[PDB]
Amino acid sequence: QAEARAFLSEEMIAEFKAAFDMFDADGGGDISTKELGTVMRMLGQNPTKEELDAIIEEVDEDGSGTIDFEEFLVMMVRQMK
């Protein structure tokens, strides 16, 4: 979470915040399975709660069951590497 904000350009960070901000429908600061499922559906997919659970669990370092912004950058940086 330290190296992600390092790796990246301020430009990339900005576009990532925008996206995050799109996913975080209630503006509370983290993405829940409900939020995740809602957007996935917009993208044609049909995920189950399990599936959603498994996706967040890969990037969830604090065990909150939700994805915050820092966990969100890591999932994209990890994506770029």
Instruction: Write out the residues near Ca ion by the rule CB under 5 A.
Output: 24, 26, 28, 60, 62, 64
For Ca ion, which residue has the nearest CB?
Answer: 64
The smaller minimum CB distance to Ca ion, of residues 21 and 62, is found at: 62
The smaller minimum CB distance to Ca ion, of residues 14 and 22, is found at: 22
Which residues touch 37 (CB under 8 Å, ≥6 apart)? 47, 49, 52
User: Three-state SS for 49?
Assistant: helix
**Residues marked as binding?**
24, 26, 30, 35, 60, 62, 64, 66, 71
